[PDB]
Amino acid sequence: ATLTAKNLAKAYKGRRVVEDVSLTVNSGEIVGLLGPNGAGKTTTFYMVVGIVPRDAGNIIIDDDDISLLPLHARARRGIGYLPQEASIFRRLSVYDNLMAVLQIRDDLSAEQREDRANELMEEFHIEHLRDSMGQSLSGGERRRVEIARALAANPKFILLDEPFAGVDPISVIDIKRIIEHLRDSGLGVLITDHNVRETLAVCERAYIVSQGHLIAHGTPTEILQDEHVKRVYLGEDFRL
Numbered sequence: 001a002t003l004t005a006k007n008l009a010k011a012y013k014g015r016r017v018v019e020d021v022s023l024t025v026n027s028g029e030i031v032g033l034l035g036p037n038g039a040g041k042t043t044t045f046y047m048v049v050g051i052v053p054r055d056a057g058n059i060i061i062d063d064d065d066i067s068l069l070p071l072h073a074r075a076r077r078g079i080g081y082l083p084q085e086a087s088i089f090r091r092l093s094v095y096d097n098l099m100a101v102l103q104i105r106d107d108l109s110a111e112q113r114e115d116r117a118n119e120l121m122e123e124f125h126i127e128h129l130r131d132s133m134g135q136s137l138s139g140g141e142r143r144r145v146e147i148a149r150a151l152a153a154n155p156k157f158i159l160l161d162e163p164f165a166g167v168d169p170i171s172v173i174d175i176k177r178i179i180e181h182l183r184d185s186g187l188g189v190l191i192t193d194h195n196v197r198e199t200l201a202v203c204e205r206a207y208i209v210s211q212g213h214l215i216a217h218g219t220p221t222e223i224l225q226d227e228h229v230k231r232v233y234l235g236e237d238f239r240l
């Protein structure tokens with residue numbers, strides 16, 4: 001499949017926080033939306049996922065324009081989303097968190113739902129936390145349950161808003177291998193980050209945003225031909 005956002009634009013109280021941001025993620029790809037803080041990354045995600053409405057632009061998946069469809073409708077069309085902050089249910093166990101979203105899987109019965117729940121706990125290495133409350137999980141364990149909870153909805157595209165935020169240096173390399181696994185499974189992965197040097201390497205293509213505008217895009221090799229981006233990458237310039 002193909003998820004495409006074309007020239008999105010969003011404004012809050014007269015201030016246009018996102019002028020013109022465009023991106024495209026295909027199945028079997030890891031596309032990045034990189035840029036400094038306050039550039040418009042999260043606002044772009046809310047427009048693609050459908051949390052906040054769009055002022056201008058289009059959100060298209062394959063031959064369907066889903067720009068005026070609410071969140072739940074785009075969720076049933078293949079879009080999965082994970083926030084930057086903690087989105088786990090802290091008062092429920094890991095098993096109860098996965099069975100939560102599996103309750104919307106009408107394509108499965110009560111037996112297959114609990115089957116996939118065990119399949120998702122072995123895949124993300126959280127079998128030893130089946131009955132553990134979400135509050136007792138560390139930063140890295142919380143994310144892997146949060147990601148597996150999104151995968152339980154069986155999406156076509158998974159959108160991670162800075163997934164490496166608030167996790168130990170051993171969990172980032174753990175989530176990075178989880179991302180490369182989802183890509184090989186046919187999903188389209190879309191991640192955001194402010195660290196451009198560390199995240200650009202795993203991106204087949206990336207879209208560099210700055211103050212609501214798109215300053216560069218393409219594969220990392222094509223992006224790192226923009227002199228302004230090379231300076232921030234090599235360390236010659238401070239602000240991107």
Ligand SMILES: CO[C@@H]1[C@@H](OC(N)=O)[C@@H](O)[C@H](Oc2ccc3c(O)c(NC(=O)[C@]45C[C@H]6C[C@H](C[C@H](C6)C4)C5)c(=O)oc3c2C)OC1(C)C
Nearest residue numbers: 088089090091092095096097098099100101102103104135
């Ligand atoms: C169909 O409904 C499903 C449920 O049913 C199933 N399986 O389908 C299930 O999926 C799940 O239900 C929930 C979801 C969330 C909570 C939850 O946030 C609680 N705790 C906190 O909010 C706090 C506790 C502390 C720590 C922080 C800040 C502050 C103080 C408040 C979190 C809570 O105690 O209970 C929840 C339950 C039962 O989500 C639903 C409602 C969509």
Ligand SMILES: Nc1ncnc2c1ncn2[C@@H]1O[C@H](COP(=O)(O)OP(=O)(O)O)[C@@H](O)[C@H]1O
Nearest residue numbers: 012013017035036037038039040041042043044
């Ligand atoms: N709900 C909101 N109301 C007002 N201003 C907002 C709102 N959400 C984001 N902004 C502003 O837009 C920019 C944030 O874009 P965000 O994409 O949320 O930053 P990042 O790109 O780090 O996610 C900042 O200027 C922030 O103050």
Ligand SMILES: [Mg+2]
Nearest residue numbers: 041042084161
């Ligand atoms: Mg953000």
